[PDB]
Amino acid sequence: SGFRKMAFPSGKVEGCMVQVTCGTTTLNGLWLDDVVYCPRHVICTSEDMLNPNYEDLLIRKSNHNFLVQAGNVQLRVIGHSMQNCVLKLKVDTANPKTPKYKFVRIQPGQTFSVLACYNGSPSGVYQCAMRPNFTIKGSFLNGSAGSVGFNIDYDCVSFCYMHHMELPTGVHAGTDLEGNFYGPFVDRQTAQAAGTDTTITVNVLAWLYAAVINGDRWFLNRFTTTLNDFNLVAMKYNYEPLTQDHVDILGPLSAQTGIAVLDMCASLKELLQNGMNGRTILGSALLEDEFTPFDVVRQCSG
């Protein structure tokens, strides 16, 4: 038992990180088959940062302008192409450590495990959720651009995120693996603030389901409520609306616990109104929206 914030084993991704250097700018690339993927702002100098012309900055580049390095071995670049905000660099050698993979685009509220690297060498791994304003709250320093966020199902690694920049607020932004940014962002060094952040409502119910499995019971409410009445109170405290799909996805946990999802909503209504009264849930004095229904089931059911 117990409940912990938990990431995916980064073994299959550890064999896909490489170093990429155009000029003296350095970051990370994703080596899959004979292709390396990385952000496009690697072709920028320390100066072209306000409004950089990535198109005009890439025409001047040739294949021998990209130093791709996999450990102590450099990969000869034979072709490069830009696609949205990422650069794809073809190499003469296919990665012998490539696993089964898909390029997915996640929705707000879904989780993925980030393997943060610097200079193509993995540094650590943590779990993050895509905030409603399409940012993440990770932990990135300079040289982190190129790190990937992924989910592993079975033996397949669904790549879903690649890191790019950090906002003035301190939250982290980036693209998917086809370069399309997550949110209204651009790869320029301008004053940018995301959208207004809401609480991922379904995950909080999912996180309260993990708490009842684990012994916590004091926040439970005998009497039910409705999907119409809860969504009325949900937005009162800046919570995403609760769709009938959300209820359906919580089906496994509504079964393991014997508490209807709408019964769990009434308990969330009481918790929102009164607070915790200095009591703790799963070791947290704040309602956590960072665990999807899948993270809860995978950690609770055998």
Binding site: H41, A191, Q192
Partner: peptide, 10 residues
């Protein structure tokens, strides 16, 4: 006050 691209420049 502005966004910081997090490659390693210098």
């Amino acid at each position: 006050t502005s966004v910081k691209l997090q490659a390693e420049f210098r």
